[PDB]
């Protein structure tokens with residue numbers, strides 16, 4: 717009964733109500749509004765909760781699901797790249813997971829700069845990209861890894877591991893098995909990098925706002941939310957956190973679209989069922 721169609725319908729009903737409540741009004745005080753005239757939101761209807769915003773000129777949010785702390789963002793606009801790199805560096809980012817595919821990035825109508833597979837200079841910031849590993853995730857899905865070295869006068873140089881799911885499908889959801897493999901790779905990559913900072917005595921270890929995995933697809937609400945949900949289920953600290961809790965938390969902390977598609981929620985439900993984790997709050 718806990719995972720039956722009735723429970724699933726009730727979960728969707730609660731989440732739909734929340735999405736509606738969280739829909740943005742004009743100049744909504746809950747959502748970040750552009751300063752200085754630059755385009756902020758890649759998608760007009762996909763907004764950035766103001767109180768959890770990372771930077772005033774990015775569509776990007778701090779998210780905590782149970783105990784699990786991440787940043788979810790949109791794919792940065794070309795005009796946002798310097799600020800996006802500064803976000804990555806200041807966060808001492810232990811992994812950047814990019815879930816927009818190579819095909820999507822290559823479609824220049826989408827305006828998604830190839831910012832992590834090429835080197836370049838963006839205002840005051842110089843970035844070098846290097847190819848590292850490739851890890852299969854199942855079903856032919858491949859994670860291509862990179863390291864980004866981010867340099868800027870007056871700033872410590874930061875290297876960021878990148879996990880790019882270069883052949884993430886855009887028309888269909890990846891399975892729970894692929895999602896689990898992806899979450900494990902992203903978590904493991906982050907743990908290795910965080911450990912390096914710990915070993916060096918970085919002050920970022922004590923700061924709630926830093927050392928967060930950064931995750932985006934195109935909008936940062938669909939594939940991104942599926943992955944964040946899977947990651948929180950991997951976290952030993954999150955016993956009894958329900959699917960209702962996780963999705964409600966993502967929605968209140970970013971926007972009401974988090975977990976955009978029913979197919980994505982289906983994966984989270986299946987992962988939860990595998991753990992005996994509740995769907996609903998009693």
Ligand code: VO4
Nearest residue numbers: 872917918919920
């Ligand atoms: O500026 V640190 O996060 O390497 O202490």
